[PDB]
């Protein structure tokens, strides 16, 4: 039997290959990204993770982007600058996907965008999924 | 705590606003659509739901598009012509999303596209969410 | 092994007993009217 999974685990676009979209995570209590590759890559593509806060002019519109800080785990060492980053390796096949998520929440808005906008960046897609809702 | 949902419930883009992308539902056992608006509409926008078979010349590539048939529910009636369809009403605000799914699987690939490619259809975004895998 | 690396399926949340409900049933005028009872489908007066 098939289910209406979208009722419980909605999905929102975050990076369609040409533009980024802030995603509101305030109503939910978990989330995670999902990367897909549509063409053969030419070099490693790094990604930056940002978070926003409610604007003063409107309490339902994101403000400017604030870069997410790092959070070292019990094993391993902190990043060179203590800021989160994501790197898609060269070996990713066109018919596979990746998954990763941040350890901490921070503000109620999140976003993701590549470090550099080039032809290699246009070959990637990023999407965000939500866990159970709180309202 | 944050759970990294993307491992268990991957989500894929289906209609970014200017192009339709086939999604391979074969590897999973449930799925569902999710609709979101980015700008106000002017009239109801209908969507067509297809399924694709494996390509004859290459088993790893999707074949031609085939319209999904309707299955009457336990207590209702079939559509005008027995084919599944969806309509996004006018009352939908920008800060809202809609979810729905088909009752039967059919082919291994699925797809969705608007009936028309006018300016209204470009304001909607669609993605597909998958439930636990089987491989 | 930690959350944000392992999937959500490894954690089972607690199940509470309370059932939220916000709907209401407005008070009825029915008890002001005159009360009659008929055991048949038709009546005369």
């Amino acid at each position: 039997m098939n289910f209406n999974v979208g009722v419980d685990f909605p999905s929102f676009i975050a990076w369609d290959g040409t533009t980024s979209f802030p995603v509101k995570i305030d109503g939910f209590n978990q989330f995670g990204f999902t990367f897909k590759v549509i063409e053969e890559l030419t070099a490693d593509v790094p990604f930056n993770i940002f978070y926003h806060e409610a604007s003063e002019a409107d309490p339902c519109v994101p403000g400017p982007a604030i870069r997410v800080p790092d959070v070292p785990f019990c094993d391993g060492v902190a990043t060179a600058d203590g800021l989160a980053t994501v790197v898609i390796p060269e070996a990713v096949a066109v018919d596979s996907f990746c998954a990763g998520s941040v350890p901490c929440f921070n503000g109620p808005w999140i976003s993701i965008a590549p470090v550099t906008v080039n032809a290699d960046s246009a070959k990637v897609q990023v999407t965000v999924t939500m866990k159970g809702a709180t309202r | 705590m944050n759970f990294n949902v993307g491992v268990d419930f991957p989500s894929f883009i289906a209609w970014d606003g200017t192009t339709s992308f086939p999604v391979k539902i074969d590897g999973f056992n449930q799925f569902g659509f999710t609709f979101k608006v980015i700008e106000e509409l002017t009239a109801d926008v209908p969507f067509n739901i297809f399924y694709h078979e494996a390509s004859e010349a290459d088993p790893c590539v999707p074949g031609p598009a085939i319209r999904v048939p309707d299955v009457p529910f336990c207590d209702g009636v079939a559509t005008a012509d027995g084919l599944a369809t969806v309509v996004i009403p006018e009352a939908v605000a920008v800060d809202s999303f809609c979810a729905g799914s088909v009752p039967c699987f059919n082919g291994p690939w699925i797809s969705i596209a608007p009936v028309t490619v006018n300016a209204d259809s470009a304001k909607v975004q669609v993605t597909v969410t998958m439930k636990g895998a089987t491989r | 092994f930690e959350a944000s690396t392992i999937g959500p399926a490894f954690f089972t949340p607690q199940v509470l007993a309370l059932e939220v409900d916000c709907n209401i049933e407005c008070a009825s005028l029915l008890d002001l009217y005159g009360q009659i009872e008929v055991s048949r489908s038709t009546f005369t007066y």
Binding site: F35, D70, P72, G76, A78, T79, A84, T85, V86, I88, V92, A93, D95, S96, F97, C98, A99, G100, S101, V102 | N4, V7, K24, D26, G27, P59, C60, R135 | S4, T5
Partner: peptide, 27 residues
């Protein structure tokens, strides 16, 4: 710092890597 998890492929092998068998030993 984030650790990515990736599946080998959506299909086990979209183009199955069917390979020749080892050549037969000498006479």
């Amino acid at each position: 710092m984030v650790s990515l998890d990736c599946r080998n492929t959506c299909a086990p092998a979209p183009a199955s890597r069917l390979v020749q068998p080892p050549c037969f030993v000498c006479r």
